[PDB]
Design a protein around this nucleic acid. Structure first.
Lengths: 124, 1129
DNA sequence: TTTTTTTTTTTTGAGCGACTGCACTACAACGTTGTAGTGCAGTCGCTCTTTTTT
């Protein structure tokens, strides 16, 4: 029991503010200040391993895939494009459930994105 | 009922022993085991004494079986000693010795029982079922070898996905809309039916017919809706009912809402305004037309497709799982019970049951509350009413808390109705008499407190030796049960939990603050003990309230442990840190992974250290060099040597032990290292272990080996333990903050009160919901009795007027819906003042109450002490000299033999061909073809190979011209194995000079370097043969890759001997042959008997060249004696 | 048959049930006005146990 304990990670570092600080640096700072202190000052980025391949086809839509589908549907309905063409495009890649359940998911997501677009393109 | 004496129990027929909580059940089992072994009882005894391999003891928990086996072995040894001495120190052993007349035969039987204790028939349920399936496999129909699987959820989810594929994919839109409204996917269906897929399949009340599909039910409901729509369209446009004060005049607008409702029948959900068109609701707010009655008949039953899909899933998924496990040949835990029940269900298996009556004519079944109906059906099939066989069901209906696992109290009620005799244990040896009187006072307020007729409660009696147990405070003697009534009218769930957790933490810190000064004590008679942190234990039921208690207790500087923590070690941050460290070790060239691994909490560096490491290139170079050394250790020695060198060079273990709260992190790191070493031996590649660690991080599945262990044992901690994990344990002081929290069962899965069978009601009938809520309340009362009967000195309760209903102030509270309030309020709904008066009504010397006080003064005092000096011993010398038994290798046209493939396997094939073939007989081509078939070579090579073999056999290898055909079977000896001793350290400089002094081939050949070899030397000589009274040696070398022409002359063979260093091998062969001929033949001379050593190169033997292929050498006859003197000493 | 490099995250609870505000009519007290019951809409708590069998 004759060892030194773990000292604190927080230490006062010397830093001089440069002349030209871009807006992207301020946006990356104010998105996450501790992450911008870690991965840019001391260049420590904790790189996690990628996710494994799932064993079955997607029966439901949740997470990043649902968010990307909603983002592309909102970018399509903001120009008043054909929702059925994007439905066939997402169904041809297998990202949608097979048969009627993918149609029901696309219909409810189209209803939600149309409710959002009726407020978005009202003042565009 | 009657009291149970272990020396007066009649062991005939079926007996039912009800051992209460805290009673000596394991002692009564050991007493009955000794009674069955010695054959005691007189008229109530067994007709014959039985051996150890005839007494069958069945207990569910494996640790309980191991403890019972050890206790029975100790009891057998103690009774053998007491019978040899005719005296003992135990009164039950005294009566056991008084019951027997003979001592020598009993001592011999106890000695034979001690020697046959390893073959005792004390198994579990599944172990006994597997043993009976493997023993009598013919009448049952079981395979001899099968593979048990631990997890069955993967195949169950696969079969559920297959059912959802083959049932939900071809449905049209109008049916798939309702299917999507019922469940989002197969995961919700599996989550619904997972409590019915495992265990015994329940009987569905009113099942659908086998020919009704989803489309027929959909068309039936569509027609039922369309009939009501037609009856609304026909009787529209009229209003004849009287307008009431409750009935507003906007109902015509609701009729307008029903006017736009009838457009298509593509939907499934009707409007709520039909609830306004009910005659039973309009009369309560005059309806004469039957359209309102047809609407009420439509809303009488819910229009749902759910029950048919659930029935098809329960019919398909279990069958697919059983078919897949029959195809793969695997087995499960319940599959042994199902196979034994199906074997006893058959006609021949009854005779198999007679074989079981031949195997064990007795049965003592412990823990009968945890009995499946298949187990009781088996035990009724074997041991119902046959003579000379006894059945002893030792259990407790007040402890049946494993209904979630598969147990059922209705099976115990059927067993109690079937058997005739009942026995109970009166004495309780665990708790103080105050707690015993509190338990007997709380549970005997009303009649049938467990709400069932077949579960009666009896007042237990306390022990005479523990009647002086007192938990004393600074003021006076604290009572046994202290119901802390939380004050207020109505409170929520989280606020009540927070307030009772704060009150419990305040009581814990008051007991610890007064316990360290000698004020709060545990007194046994006159002996006293201060209350440490390990004495107080909080009994919770869920994980969320356990975390609430731990957070409310760690705020007051009180450490607490969670005994029911089953979380995996791979889900913590230390597993990710070890993964980053292994990725930095495997790839130390890229600085990004090394920088991400160095900044972890395992290394423990400041930001200034990381900045100076990024600035200084030489320190990063040293880090990369030491990580390359770690990679070299990891590639040569393994996982744990690399981890130990990393923890010793960086000294991170001492830094984690110096840091407060880092010992649990160090134990997690050590367990992760042990698991990585256990998984690294089964994997060959180095990246495969990293992928396995990342997968086990991504897989939070809980195995028995991959769970978190206890961090420390020396430091006393407050042990939080759930009620199911506290069954059979013992705690001095017990706090129950959330004993009033209850949860209402929603699903309708009950048991019939007459047939005692599992009835699953897929329709929402209120009678099934009430019958399930009654069983839920009985389970909550059994959990209350389990949680109450674990305290020894003092128990504290948290009472509050908890309201599960969403209304805040409704004038009544839901404590009568809980288990504690059913005994406090006598099963009657009351208020908070009524609950307080019911609490204050049952006030005795053991039962008191106090209000909940919110307040904190100071957390605690550490009162640490110094550590004495300690040192480690150091080894003075080397552990061992270089002793190793080694060999010579340790000290170092289109078809032609030149076109033969050169390798080790063809060399060994030609060596085996020359070993197995006889030299006198001519070579047969079909034998060469069969040998090439056995070896696996090409068949076209065979007719050239045999003539080449005869060309080898026709070529003589001697200085006189002696062929191999002249050697008889007694003269030849193939593959002589010799061991040669050497007691001196073999110096290469003293040996190579002695070789070069006499051997002429050592002119070149710079000397090889080898360590000092002391010990034995192995050798395998190919052939030794005598001829005309002279011995000769023959070896085979057949690699010969670099020669295809006739260039293998004596110069090329001498160059090959100098390059491959076969001179030392031939010299050791000459030394071994000289020692062999000296040991075997008396009057032996080296010059007279030995003739020389012949080396036979197989690919160099030609028909026209007799000298090519053979190499004859004779030593100088002076090197052998000096080498023998060197090897001897 | 030869060969070229690359550093950016993003998302995620909703149905059940109560509280209160606003409107709207029904009915009795003083044609009109005050009291009471009901319905629609915005806003807010809450909540989803326990474990071990070779």
């Amino acid at each position: 029991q004759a060892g030194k304990a773990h000292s604190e990670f927080v230490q006062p570092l010397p830093f001089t503010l440069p002349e030209t600080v871009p807006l992207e640096t301020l946006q990356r700072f104010w998105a996450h200040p501790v992450r911008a202190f870690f991965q840019m000052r001391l260049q420590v980025n904790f790189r996690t391993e990628d996710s494994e391949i799932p064993d079955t086809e997607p029966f439901i839509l949740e997470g990043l895939s649902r968010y990307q589908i909603n983002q592309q549907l909102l970018n399509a309905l903001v120009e008043q494009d054909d929702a059925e063409r994007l439905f066939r495009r997402f169904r041809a890649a297998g990202d949608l459930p097979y048969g009627a359940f993918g149609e029901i998911f696309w219909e409810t997501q189209c209803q939600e994105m149309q409710q959002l677009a009726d407020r978005v393109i009202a003042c565009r | 009922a009657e009291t149970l004496d272990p020396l007066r129990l009649p062991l005939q027929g079926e007996r039912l022993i009800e051992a209460s909580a805290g009673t000596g059940k394991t002692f009564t089992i050991a007493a009955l085991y000794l009674r069955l072994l010695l054959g005691l009882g007189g008229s109530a005894a067994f007709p014959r004494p039985l051996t150890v391999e005839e007494l069958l003891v069945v207990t569910f928990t494996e640790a309980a079986t191991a403890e019972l086996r050890g206790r029975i072995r100790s009891n057998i040894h103690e009774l053998r000693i007491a019978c040899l001495r005719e005296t003992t120190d135990n009164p039950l052993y005294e009566r056991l010795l008084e019951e027997i007349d003979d001592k020598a035969q009993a001592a011999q039987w106890l000695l034979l029982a001690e020697r046959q204790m390893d073959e005792a028939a004390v198994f579990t349920i599944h172990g006994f079922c597997q043993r009976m399936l493997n023993l009598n496999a013919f009448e049952s129909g079981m395979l001899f070898e099968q593979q048990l699987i631990e997890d069955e959820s993967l195949l169950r989810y696969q079969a559920c996905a297959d059912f959802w594929r083959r049932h939900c994919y071809p449905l049209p839109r109008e049916i798939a809309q309702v299917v999507f409204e019922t469940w989002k996917g197969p995961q919700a269906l599996l989550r619904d039916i997972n409590r019915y897929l495992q265990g015994e399949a329940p009987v569905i009340k009113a099942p659908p017919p086998d020919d009704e599909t989803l489309a027929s039910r959909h068309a039936q409901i569509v027609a039922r809706i369309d009939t009501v729509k037609q009856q609304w369209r026909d009787a529209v446009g009229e209003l004849d009912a009287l307008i009431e004060s409750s009935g507003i005049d906007r109902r015509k607008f609701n009729r307008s809402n029903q006017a736009k409702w009838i457009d298509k029948i593509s939907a499934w959900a009707e409007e709520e305004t039909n609830s306004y068109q009910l005659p039973e609701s309009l009369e309560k707010f005059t309806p004469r037309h039957p359209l309102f009655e047809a609407i009420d008949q439509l809303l009488a039953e819910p229009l749902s497709i759910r029950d048919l899909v659930i029935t098809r899933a329960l019919a398909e998924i279990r069958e697919t799982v059983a078919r897949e496990k029959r195809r793969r040949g695997e087995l499960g835990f319940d599959d042994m019970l199902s196979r034994l029940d199906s074997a006893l269900r058959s006609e021949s298996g009854e005779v198999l049951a007679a074989a079981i009556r031949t195997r064990f004519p007795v049965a003592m079944i412990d823990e009968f509350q945890d009995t499946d109906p298949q187990q009781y059906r088996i035990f009724r099939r074997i041991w119902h009413h046959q003579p000379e066989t006894a059945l002893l069901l030792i259990g407790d209906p007040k402890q049946a808390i494993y209904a979630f696992r598969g147990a059922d109290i209705f099976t115990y009620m059927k067993a109690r109705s079937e058997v005739h005799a009942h026995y109970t244990l009166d004495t309780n040896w665990r708790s103080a008499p105050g707690m015993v009187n509190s338990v007997n006072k709380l549970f005997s307020q009303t009649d049938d407190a467990f709400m069932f007729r077949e579960i009666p409660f009896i007042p237990v009696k306390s022990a005479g030796k523990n009647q002086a147990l007192r938990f004393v405070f600074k003021g006076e003697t604290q009572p046994a049960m202290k119901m802390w009534l939380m004050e207020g009218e109505s409170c929520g769930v989280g606020d009540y939990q927070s307030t009772m957790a704060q009150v419990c933490a305040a009581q814990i810190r008051d007991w610890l603050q007064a316990g360290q000064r000698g004020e709060a004590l545990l007194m046994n008679g006159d002996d006293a003990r201060p209350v440490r942190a390990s004495d107080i234990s909080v009994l919770v039921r869920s994980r969320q309230e356990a975390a609430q208690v731990r957070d409310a207790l760690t705020l007051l500087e009180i450490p607490s442990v969670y005994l029911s923590n089953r979380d995996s070690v791979f889900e913590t941050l230390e597993a990710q840190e070890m993964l980053w460290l292994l990725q930095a070790v495997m790839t130390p060239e890229r600085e990004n992974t090394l920088r991400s691994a160095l900044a972890t909490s395992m290394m423990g560096l400041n930001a200034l250290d990381i900045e100076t490491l990024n600035n200084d290139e030489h320190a990063w170079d040293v880090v990369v060099e030491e990580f390359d050394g770690y990679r070299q250790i990891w590639r040569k020695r393994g996982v744990m040597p690399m981890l130990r060198a990393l923890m010793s060079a960086r000294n991170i273990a001492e830094n984690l032990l110096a840091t407060a709260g880092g010992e649990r992190r160090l134990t997690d790191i050590l367990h992760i290292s042990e698991l990585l070493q256990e998984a690294g031996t089964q994997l060959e590649s180095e990246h495969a272990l990293v992928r396995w660690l990342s997968q086990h991080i991504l897989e939070p599945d809980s195995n028995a080996s991959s769970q978190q262990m206890r961090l420390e044992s020396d430091k006393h901690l407050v042990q939080i333990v759930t009620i199911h994990k506290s069954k059979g344990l013992e705690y001095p002081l017990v706090w129950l903050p959330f004993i009033t929290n209850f949860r209402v069962q929603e699903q309708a899965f009950y048991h019939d009160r007459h047939s005692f069978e599992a009835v699953l009601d897929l329709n929402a009938a209120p009678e099934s919901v009430d019958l399930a809520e009654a069983e839920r309340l009985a389970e909550d009362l059994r959990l209350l009795y389990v949680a109450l009967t674990r305290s020894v000195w003092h128990c504290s309760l948290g009472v509050a007027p908890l309201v599960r209903r969403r209304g805040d102030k409704k004038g009544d509270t839901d404590v009568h819906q809980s288990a504690l309030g059913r005994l406090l309020q006598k099963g009657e709904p009351q208020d908070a003042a009524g609950l307080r008066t019911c609490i204050e009504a049952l006030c005795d010397d053991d039962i008191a109450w106090q209000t909940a006080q919110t307040g904190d003064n100071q957390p605690w005092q550490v009162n640490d002490v110094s550590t004495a000096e300690l040192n480690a011993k150091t080894l003075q010398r080397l552990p061992g000299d270089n002793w190793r038994v080694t060999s010579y290798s340790g000290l170092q046209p289109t078809l032609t033999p030149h076109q033969f493939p050169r390798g080790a396997s063809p060399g060994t094939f030609l060596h085996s061909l020359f070993e197995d073939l006889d030299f006198t007989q001519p070579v047969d081509p079909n034998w060469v073809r069969e040998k090439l078939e056995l070896g696996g070579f090409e068949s076209q090579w065979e007719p050239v190979l045999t003539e080449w073999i005869t060309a080898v056999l026709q070529a003589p290898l001697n200085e006189t011209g002696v062929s191999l055909s002249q050697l008889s079977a007694r003269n030849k000896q193939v593959e002589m194995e010799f061991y040669l001793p050497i007691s001196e350290p073999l110096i290469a400089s003293q040996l190579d000079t002695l070789i070069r002094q006499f051997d002429p081939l050592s002119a070149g050949c710079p000397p090889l370097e080898f360590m000092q070899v002391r010990g034995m030397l192995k050798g395998f000589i190919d052939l030794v043969f005598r001829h005309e009274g002279r011995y000769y040696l023959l070896a085979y070398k057949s690699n010969w890759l670099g020669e295809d022409s006739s260039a293998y002359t004596q110069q090329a063979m001498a160059a090959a001997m100098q390059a491959h260093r076969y001179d030392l091998q031939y010299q050791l062969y000459t030394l071994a042959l000289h020692r062999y001929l000296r040991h075997r033949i008396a009057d032996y001379d080296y010059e007279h008997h030995f003739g020389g050593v012949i080396y036979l190169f197989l690919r160099g033997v030609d028909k026209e060249h007799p000298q090519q292929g053979i190499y004859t050498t004779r030593p100088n006859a002076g090197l052998i004696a000096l080498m023998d003197e060197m090897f001897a000493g």
